[PDB]
C-alpha cells in the first residue's frame, strides 16, 4: 500500500483509502503509468481555495501514478436522484451561490473548467458536508497568462470538449471556451435541478454526432422565456446575462450572486445550509 504511509480499497479512476499515519479516510485516484499528474498540478494551484480538494500527496508506487485526495462526499446527480430529482426552490439558490463562487475562484486561478454539470458538484464530508466542492479538472485549460492575464484567442469550428446537454450555444457553434461558458452551463444545471429534465435531453439519436447535432439544433430552438417558465424569473435573466458575455469580458459574478440572492430573501430563505437531502429520514 501506497506512500510508506497510505492504504488502499474499491471505490481516470477512484479508490477509498486511509492516511493511516492520522487516522483519516482518502480517496485515491490512481493512473497507469498521461492526465493525473497534470490535473495534480492544476490542483495545486486550485489548493488552499474554498471548495476545491485538498491534494495531500502524488507519487507513484509500481505500476501507477498515485494521486491522494481528501475524501469528499456524494454528487449533485447523486443527491439529486437521491431527490427523486426534484430539489426545492430553496436547494437550487443554496447551491446557486456557492457554484457560482467556485467558477468564480477557479477563474482568479487563470483556469476555466469546461465541464460543469451535476456530476463534477460534491457535497464535502462532516463539519464541510454544507461545503459545495468541484473537481475533475481533466478538462481545465488555463484561458490567460499567469502574469500578463492575456486571454487565449478567439477560435472557431473546434468539436466540443465537455458533456452535451450543458454546453453553451457558442460551444454547440465551435467557439473557444471561456469564463462565460461554465456559468452559462450552470445556468442550464440550474434549470435542470429545477425541471428534473433538459429539453434537449433524450433526443433520438441513431449515431453519436446527429445527436450533438439534434441538442444544438434543439438548443438554439429553445428561447429561454420558454425554458425557464413556471420558474423565478432571477433563472432566465441569469442565462440571459451570461449569452450576453463577450469571449474575454469579465464576468460580473457578484451581480449573478445577488440576483439569486434578492429572490432568496425574498422568499424568506436563510441560508442555514439546509438542503434537502439533509431532511431525508
Not at 52 to 71: F, H, K, Q, S
Not at 102 to 128: A, Q
Not at 163 to 190: F, K
Request: aromatic share 12%; with cysteine; hydrophobic share 35%.
Amino acid at each position: 500500500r501506497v506512500g510508506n504511509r497510505y492504504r488502499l480499497g474499491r471505490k481516470g479512476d477512484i479508490y477509498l483509502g486511509t492516511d493511516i499515519a492520522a487516522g483519516e479516510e482518502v480517496a485515491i485516484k490512481l493512473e497507469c503509468v498521461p492526465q493525473l499528474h497534470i490535473e495534480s498540478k492544476i490542483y495545486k494551484m486550485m489548493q488552499g481555495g474554498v471548495g476545491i480538494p485538498t491534494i495531500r500527496w502524488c507519487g507513484a508506487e509500481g505500476d501507477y501514478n498515485v494521486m491522494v485526495m481528501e475524501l469528499l462526499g456524494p454528487s449533485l446527480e447523486d443527491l439529486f436522484n437521491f431527490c427523486s430529482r426534484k430539489f426545492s426552490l430553496k436547494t437550487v439558490l443554496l447551491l446557486a451561490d456557492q457554484m457560482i463562487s467556485r467558477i468564480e475562484y477557479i477563474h482568479s486561478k487563470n483556469f476555466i473548467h469546461r465541464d460543469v454539470k451535476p456530476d463534477n458538484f460534491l457535497m464535502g464530508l462532516g463539519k464541510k458536508g454544507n461545503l459545495v466542492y468541484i473537481i475533475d479538472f481533466g478538462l481545465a485549460k488555463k484561458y490567460r497568462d499567469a502574469r500578463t492575464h492575456q486571454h487565449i484567442p478567439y477560435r472557431e469550428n473546434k468539436n466540443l470538449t465537455g458533456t452535451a446537454r450543458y454546453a453553451s450555444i457558442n460551444t454547440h457553434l465551435g467557439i473557444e471556451q471561456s469564463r462565460r461558458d461554465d456559468l452559462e452551463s450552470l445556468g442550464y444545471v440550474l434549470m435542470y435541478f429545477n425541471l428534473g429534465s433538459l429539453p434537449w435531453q433524450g433526443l433520438k439519436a441513431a449515431t453519436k454526432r446527429q445527436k450533438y447535432e439534434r441538442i444544438s439544433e434543439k438548443k438554439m430552438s429553445t428561447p429561454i422565456e420558454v425554458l425557464c417558465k413556471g420558474y423565478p424569473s432571477e433563472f432566465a435573466t441569469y442565462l440571459n446575462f451570461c449569452r450576453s458575455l463577450r469571449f474575454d469580458d469579465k464576468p460580473d459574478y457578484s451581480y449573478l450572486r445577488q440576483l439569486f440572492r434578492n429572490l432568496f430573501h425574498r422568499q424568506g430563505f436563510s441560508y442555514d445550509y439546509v438542503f434537502d437531502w439533509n431532511m431525508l429520514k
